Design a protein around this ligand. Structure first.
Ligand code: ANP
Length: 280
């Protein structure tokens, strides 16, 4: 594993930035690694532009140019990174659509096909990262936002962060036995399960018990899902990572060709030709 320290970045077009070129407007949210702020760029070619800002102690990209390669239609863009006073500042797209789960909660009647749209965009994003040797690792609802047009935007791209949710973690991750991109497809299944049923597949009274459940508990198949949805769940919820959908020879194509996704034109999806089920 090649660990790439994140210390500096300037998007093409921009000029090198520093803390004095921004002003704080408000807090956008709070993550495990700290608050996320709304900031305004006060000077430079992009003066007056709004961005999100994270302030960490440090961040590294573990990989089994890169900060440009991770660019994708459904992944947040990093515009700047700089360090000042033992702190790392990350300046990112301001994602304006709020989180996906909140948008879904505002809808009484959403369908399997609605959820399928968001899962499909998420799958493209995940595979993109995998293609670069990156594993998302900590995929959870709070990382899945929407842009102003209602398309998926992940809030990170696999950074291992240090500041200044076991429910989504794969069995092989829980027991510290190993770790590959296959773990991301388990998390993917958990998100699918949760969006389609309104409940988590594994959750105990505390983290200790949740972990044991992930490793050994039975799981009932939701009976009011389509046969295709049930099949995808069965294929993602393999505790042996080598046998999990997406881990075979054809990789992500195993997922894209699955009957659940038969309605999706992946090329049109990538190009954002398909209208999202709901608008911000
Ligand atoms: N680019 C963004 N634009 C707007 N809001 C954001 C952005 N990134 C994060 N947020 C908000 O901040 C919350 C936390 O985001 P997250 O990326 O999880 O932060 P983090 O510090 O990396 N913590 P975590 O990822 O949980 O370890 C999200 O759920 C959003 O509500």
């Amino acid at each position: 594993i090649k660990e790439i320290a994140i210390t500096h970045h300037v998007k093409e077009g921009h000029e090198k930035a520093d803390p004095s070129q921004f002003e704080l407007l408000k807090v956008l949210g709070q993550g495990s690694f700290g608050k996320v702020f709304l900031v305004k760029k006060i000077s430079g070619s992009d003066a007056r532009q709004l961005y999100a800002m994270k302030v960490l102690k440090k961040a590294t990209l573990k990989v089994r140019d890169i900060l440009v390669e991770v660019n994708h239609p459904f992944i947040v863009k990093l515009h700047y990174a700089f360090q000042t006073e033992g702190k790392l500042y990350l300046i990112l797209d301001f994602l304006r659509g709020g989180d996906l789960f909140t948008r879904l909660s505002k809808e009484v009647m959403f369908t399997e096909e609605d959820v399928k749209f968001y899962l499909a965009e998420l799958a493209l994003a995940l595979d993109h990262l995998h293609s670069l040797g990156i594993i998302y690792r900590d995929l959870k609802p709070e990382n899945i936002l929407l842009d102003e047009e209602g398309h998926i935007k992940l809030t990170d791209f696999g950074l291992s962060k240090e500041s200044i949710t076991v429910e989504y973690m794969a069995p092989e991750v829980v027991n510290r036995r190993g770790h590959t991109q296959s773990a991301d497809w388990w998390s993917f299944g958990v998100l699918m399960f949760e969006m389609l049923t309104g409940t988590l597949p594994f959750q105990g009274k505390d983290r200790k018990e949740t972990m044991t459940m992930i490793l050994k508990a039975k799981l009932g198949m939701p009976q009011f899902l389509s046969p295709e949805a049930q099949s995808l769940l069965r294929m993602l919820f393999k505790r042996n990572p080598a046998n999990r959908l997406g881990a075979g020879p054809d990789g992500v194509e195993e997922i894209k060709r699955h009957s659940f996704f038969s309605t999706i034109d992946w090329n049109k999806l990538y190009r954002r030709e398909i209208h999202p089920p709901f608008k911000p």
